[PDB]
Design an enzyme around this catalytic site. Structure first.
Site, PDB file in Angstrom:
ATOM      1  N   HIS A   1       0.803  -1.214   0.000  1.00 11.68           N
ATOM      2  CA  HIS A   1       0.000   0.000   0.000  1.00 11.68           C
ATOM      3  C   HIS A   1       0.839   1.268   0.000  1.00 11.68           C
TER       4      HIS A   1
HETATM    5  S1  FES Z   1       0.548  -3.490   3.216  1.00  8.54           S
HETATM    6 FE1  FES Z   1      -1.675  -3.663   3.193  1.00  8.54          FE
HETATM    7  S2  FES Z   1      -1.749  -2.001   4.669  1.00  8.54           S
HETATM    8 FE2  FES Z   1       0.451  -2.330   5.136  1.00  8.54          FE
END
Ligand code: FES
Ligand code: HEM
Ligand code: HEM
Ligand code: HEM
Ligand code: HEM
Ligand code: ZL5
Ligand code: ZL5
Lengths: 38, 384, 181, 88, 122, 384, 122, 88
Positions: C148
């Protein structure tokens, strides 16, 4: 609703059996023997 | 009495496949059911022929899969049949559910059937995921990690249930062995749910496109619909051969061929295509607990569909607004699935939130409102 | 209509409520004993799902600590999850000295996130969809969650991204050039 | 068992005395009587009737998707970098 | 699911006001025409979900001639859907033949059921 | 209609367990059926909980079993439950078949049932043996070797079928993986044959000790025979607990705890106790092909039993000579099993040949002759 | 399985010769007495396997009084088996009461079946 | 479905009009009326009646087994060695 009586019976039998087993197997258990080998 | 009706086993086979009184007006969309059965069968067959050479151990899992591909006679064929047949099983199931929604096979008489079907659907994905974790590729390992972490969101039992399912402090050999056993079994529990679904169908029979009583004109399953099932089965097997032989890895993800290691995280942890619509929701909802709740609701609201459908007419074939809403729902579902595989980019995150919002709004607003409005329109049109 | 056979001997001596009460007590006792036995059996079986003795023994395993370059981030495999054992130099400690009560999902400081700047321990698993963060791509200067793009601060706090909490700090204790889990 | 479908003897249908049915042994009939005309004319008729209900929702959804994809592409190109910083 | 009584009540709620009738009635007529059921030889009442005790009771009380005509219409619709062909405008059910023949019986059954529920609930 | 009769699934459960009209005169011997079902269930349960920790690989098989015993929580309990439950399953099946023979439940109306039952029996042994091969103990390995070698006796296909089943040139990793997969599966096919057996029973109902129509006095299975089933189930579980906890390895063979190696042959290659009667036959017949043919005939001749039983009266409870012959057959069967585990000694080989001879002679002579003689005796007695 | 006609033929084959009757009839009487069915209120004919089309036909052809007496005997036997108790010698079925009442009907049914098979086989 | 057993309404039993059945609510009867007398007297009666049919086959088979076992033991004992060579 049923789980209450089942848990009560489970606990009753477990504690009773554990106490009786410990008293009947007293000398042969590790807890009572460790002191001699200290 | 003919022997096909006196003998108990042949009596059952007759009642279900020979003289089962299907409506005469059912089109090819009603042949998906049998197709799904075939899919299950082939999967089980392939699965068994994979269990004979697959090793559940974590260190031997992926290597054993490659042993199947490279050394076992026809091992590549069975492996690809199983992998692509999972995807094809879900294609058939999605078309199955789409037909049920479009032609209103979820309404009162078969609500019970509907419920069973919903359960099967959930079970099926909770068998597919398990299977995908067996190969223990990078995607397999990290999907298992992500899902099991999401299970930790439960307040009272989530803190310690995750080690309980893992068999350890992280996805490891106990986890893969557990998934192998549960994955070999759960399809066989699902084989029982399939029989239950068939009986729930047989009690009231199958619906028809026109959405009216089929009792006026019924035909035996055999030969007519047996041969229609044969046509759809050969079409399905032809497309299945296309994928299996000439393009097997397109449906899968390349990263799954990398041996899984917890230390390296792939750039994109994404499920196979047919879990994408649900995972998209899991990505859209901020809260992990809320995320999993919404992910499972996206399936369970099918259970509320029969009660939210206030229509007095079965199916949508004669319903303009209902057809429009259903097709918009289908395209929204496809869009949600497509967003499932993309990274978390701004427009994609807002669009995923809106797509989940509308996906649930379909069931909880549109079907009620549209159905009531269409009943009113029908009566106020024919009233003249 | 006709003479019935004499049940005189067959009759019970209990009252209407007494016999019914005793029968229901016996049936309920049988039901609850069966419930207790089934609970015991099911719990014994489900305990198989739990971590076996092998897994428990393998965990809580010390890591070979020692001298390492300042600022370098080492990796381990304690309990499967990568451990980002890094010996952040005095620069990291100085940077963490700037407190932050706002603009941080869980304001914290090296006071509790680490025992000594000479040895910083933190599990590499991320918060949302636990993944192994990159050791140099963090927007805040620490680790970065590639899935993310989340940025982990040099103190492990979640700076930006979908992080639901801060970078977990294992329960590993420190000692003389050793890690004592 | 008030199943709304029964077996062949009583399928639950109401009384339908005044209707007559007619069919020719397939051993005497054409299999391809309408195939050529059907596959073109009838298929086009079905497609034309059902088109709008597929097209309008598809146009709406695909337009939204194209807008979102184009916006994301613009964000990740250089000219959009600053706005990517502004939005995030 | 929706009680026929409720939909009839809503339709009369609208029709009692020309302000809304003049707007919706043309739309309703166009919707019914485009619904495509008429071209299959079906009337609106034929589409109603039979598999409901109220609907089954209403059908059972239907006069013989209406019942036979309905059976023929349903059979014709099934044959047309099976053969993937539609009646021409000449043979299609004209708008004026959508007589709502089954509504009175359904409403009688609904009234009986509602009276039963109301009486036994006190 | 009560909800237990309207709902399709509760309707089936009612038809089979609640309102099933069992004869009032059925004694406890009729409760073995349900017992067997329970056994199967428990076995499957245990089996699943072993698959989560067992490794099919030859090198990891025995070590994984020991891991279950020593490291997995309650792993010893599940392992012993499975092992001793196989033996108890066969005890219940032997008593089941003994009741069927004694009370003549194999006669005309239930001949169909009989045959399914017979198939189940064969299948069950072909599941038990396979399971015993999974542990890959010395006895396991050498039993697999012996059985597969005996399979080679077939003239036209025996030369190459043995490598086909092995997956190699001798019992090795492919063989153990194959047996693990087929052994996880075949109990689940057997669960289908159990349902088929139940339906073949339900069509004509169950017999009674008196060997006359139960229709004069039937009782619902619930509560009476449900509670009789609970009594027998608790008795079975109590004895099963005796064996599992206080004496688990008595039924098994110690040599199976030695890691199997093809280079060392144990002094006595012998099956578990309940395969002994059949293996004895295999030892008695000189020819390997003849040996396997007779071993399978010893089971399949049960299919001929209903036609060789010329009795006009169901069951033996009122038949002196038939009861005597049946008890002599049972003791001959026990003697054959006992000879199964002994070495090949002169008196033992001759006695095994004679025991097999009489075992087959029972079906092919004694039942016909005794039944006809007893019909004649009844009629010529009551004629006065 | 064995046709009642065949067993009756064999019994008459033996009984026609005192050389064998004087030897077997005492043995047959002792074997029927030891069979244990009489003490349960059952006659020989009650033990016969009913589940056979010939046997079902014969029972359906049985007179009302005999049919009811047979029903009571079967019910009593089932009750005695259920209660694990036996009638005393006073209440047991006396040897002279084993009248073989059902044999004539079974033989008639067997003759009809054999005539059918013989006639259709030519 | 000419099954020789039907459901409760028609189990296939013939007409049994002149028979009457009698039972007491179990809530009003003894559960142990015959238990004490039964378990001894009745059980011994059943065992005595059924004994011979089990004893005679059992004695026959066990006598044969004992003869075989004793002969084998004699064979493998030193005194029987020569005979073991003769028989084999
Ligand atoms: S990688 Fe999915 S929120 Fe940290
Ligand atoms: C509804 C039934 C099933 C579904 C939907 C399903 C689905 C899947 C999927 C999606 C995969 C991933 C494969 C890949 O990523 O390439 C997989 C792998 C696997 N499944 Fe299944 N599965 C089913 C039943 C079974 C059965 C019955 C078995 C065994 C009998 C089985 C055993 C396996 C094995 C061993 C693998 C990995 C082996 C390999 O890829 O080499 N599954 N399954
Ligand atoms: C997974 C294996 C499945 C099998 C073996 C199966 C079997 C069948 C079959 C043969 C039919 C009749 C023919 C047809 O509808 O195509 C049917 C009907 C139906 N199925 Fe399934 N099905 C499966 C999956 C599902 C699922 C997961 C659902 C969930 C909603 C579902 C919902 C329905 C409905 C609503 C009907 C009634 C259709 C009608 O009456 O027109 N099916 N099923
Ligand atoms: C292996 C699992 C089995 C299950 C689940 C099962 C189930 C049952 C049940 C519940 C009954 C009625 C009650 C009883 O007889 O105990 C029955 C009857 C019967 N079974 Fe099985 N059984 C099994 C094994 C077998 C086998 C392997 C045979 C092979 C001959 C067999 C032969 C029979 C016969 C002849 C009857 C009829 C008994 C009668 O009518 O009195 N059983 N079965
Ligand atoms: C009728 C059903 C079954 C029978 C009669 C049966 C019988 C047996 C027997 C006799 C053994 C030998 C154990 C020993 O020698 O100690 C065994 C071992 C084994 N069986 Fe089963 N089995 C059955 C079903 C299953 C099922 C359903 C599974 C898995 C789902 C399974 C998996 C295993 C495994 C893993 C072992 C060896 C594991 C160990 O002993 O540690 N079996 N089985
Ligand atoms: C690789 C991966 C990443 C993220 C999620 C998933 C899932 C997944 C599983 C479930 C269920 F709870 F049902 F298990 C629900 C939603 C999901 F997104 N699964 N996987 C692997 C995979 N994807 N498709 N298959 C055949 N396996 C993921
Ligand atoms: C160890 C061993 C030696 C010799 C024979 C056998 C058999 C065996 C198997 C079959 C069947 F074809 F059915 F497989 C038939 C007859 C047999 F003698 N099996 N085994 C191991 C064993 N014995 N009992 N179990 C639960 N496993 C042997």
């Amino acid at each position: 609703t049923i789980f209450g009586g089942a848990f009560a019976f489970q606990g009753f039998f477990d504690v009773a059996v554990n106490k009786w087993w410990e008293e009947h197997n007293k000398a042969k258990l590790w807890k009572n023997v460790k002191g001699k080998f200290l | 009495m003919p022997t096909r009706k006196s003998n108990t086993y042949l009596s059952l086979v007759n009642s279900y496949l020979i003289d089962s009184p299907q409506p005469s007006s059912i089109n090819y969309w009603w042949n998906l059911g049998s197709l799904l059965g075939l899919c299950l069968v082939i999967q089980i067959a392939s699965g068994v022929f994979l269990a004979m050479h697959y090793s559940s151990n974590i260190e031997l899992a992926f290597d054993s899969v490659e042993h199947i591909m490279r050394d076992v006679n026809a091992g590549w064929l069975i492996r690809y049949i199983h992998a692509n047949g999972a995807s094809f099983f879900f294609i058939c199931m999605y078309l199955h559910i789409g037909k049920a929604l479009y032609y209103g096979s979820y309404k009162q008489p078969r609500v019970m059937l509907w419920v069973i079907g919903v359960v099967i659907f959930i079970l099926t994905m909770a068998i597919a995921f398990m299977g995908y974790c067996l190969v223990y590729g990078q995607m397999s390992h990290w999907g298992a990690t992500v899902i099991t972490n999401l299970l930790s969101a439960i307040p009272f039992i989530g803190n310690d249930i995750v080690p309980f399912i893992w068999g350890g402090f992280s996805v490891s050999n106990p986890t893969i062995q557990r998934f192998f056993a549960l994955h070999f079994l759960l399809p066989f529990i699902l084989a029982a749910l399939v029989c239950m679904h068939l009986m729930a169908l047989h009690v009231h029979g199958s619906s028809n496109p026109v959405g009216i009583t089929g009792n006026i004109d019924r035909l035996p399953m055999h030969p007519y619909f047996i041969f229609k099932d044969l046509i759809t089965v050969f079409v399905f097997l032809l497309i299945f051969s296309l994928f299996v032989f000439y393009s097997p890895n397109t449906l899968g993800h390349p990263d799954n061929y990398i041996p899984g290691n917890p230390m390296v995280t792939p750039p994109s942890i994404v499920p196979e295509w047919y879990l994408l619509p649900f995972y998209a929701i899991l990505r859209s909802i901020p809260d992990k607990l809320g995320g999993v709740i919404a992910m499972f609701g996206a399936i369970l609201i099918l259970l509320s569909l029969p009660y939210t459908d206030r229509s007095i007419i079965r199916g949508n074939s004669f319903k303009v607004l209902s057809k429009l809403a259903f097709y918009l729902f289908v395209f929204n579902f496809i869009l949600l699935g497509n967003l499932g595989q993309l990274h978390v980019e701004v427009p994609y995150i807002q669009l995923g939130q809106f797509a989940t919002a509308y996906y649930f709004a379909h069931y909880i607003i549109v079907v009620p409102v549209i159905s009531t409005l269409e009943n009113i329109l029908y009566y106020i049109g024919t009233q003249t | 209509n006709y003479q019935q056979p004499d049940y005189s001997s067959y009759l019970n001596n209990k009252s209407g409520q007494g016999s019914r009460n005793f029968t229901y007590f016996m049936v309920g006792s049988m039901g609850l004993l069966s419930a207790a036995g089934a609970k015991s059996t099911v719990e014994a079986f489900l305990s198989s799902f739990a971590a076996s003795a092998d897994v428990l023994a393998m965990a809580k395993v010390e890591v070979k600590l020692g001298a390492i370059p300042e600022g370098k981030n080492v990796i381990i495999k304690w309990q499967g999850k990568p451990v980002f054992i890094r010996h952040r130099t005095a620069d990291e400690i100085e940077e963490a000295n700037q407190v932050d009560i706002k603009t941080l999902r869980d304001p914290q400081n090296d006071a509790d996130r680490v025992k000594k700047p000479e040895w910083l321990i933190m599990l590499g698993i991320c918060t949302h969809l636990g993944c192994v963060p990159i050791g140099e791509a963090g927007d805040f200067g620490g680790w970065f969650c590639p899935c993310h793009g989340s940025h982990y601060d040099i103190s492990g706090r979640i700076r930006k991204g979908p992080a639901p909490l801060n970078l977990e700090i294992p329960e590993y204790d420190f000692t003389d050039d050793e890690t004592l889990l | 068992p008030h199943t709304y479908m029964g077996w062949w003897g009583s399928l639950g249908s109401p009384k339908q005395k005044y209707i007559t049915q007619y069919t020719i042994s397939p051993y005497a009939a054409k299999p391809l009587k309408g195939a050529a005309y059907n596959a073109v004319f009838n298929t086009f008729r079905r497609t034309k009737n059902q088109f709008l209900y597929v097209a309008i929702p598809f146009v709406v959804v695909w337009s939204i998707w194209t807008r979102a994809r184009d916006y994301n592409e613009y964000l990740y190109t250089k000219e959009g970098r600053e706005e990517l910083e502004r939005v995030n | 699911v929706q009680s026929m009584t409720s939909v009839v009540k809503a339709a009369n709620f609208i029709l009692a006001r020309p302000t809304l009738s003049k707007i919706i009635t043309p739309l309703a007529q166009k919707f019914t025409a485009y619904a495509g059921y008429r071209e299959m030889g079906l009337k609106f009442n034929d589409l109603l979900l039979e598999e409901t005790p109220i609907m089954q009771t209403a059908i059972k009380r239907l006069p013989s001639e209406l019942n036979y005509s309905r059976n023929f219409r349903i059979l014709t619709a099934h044959q047309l859907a099976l053969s993937h062909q539609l009646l021409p405008a000449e043979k299609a059910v004209k708008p004026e033949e959508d007589d709502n023949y089954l509504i009175p019986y359904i409403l009688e059954a609904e009234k009986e059921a509602f009276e039963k529920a109301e009486l036994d609930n006190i």
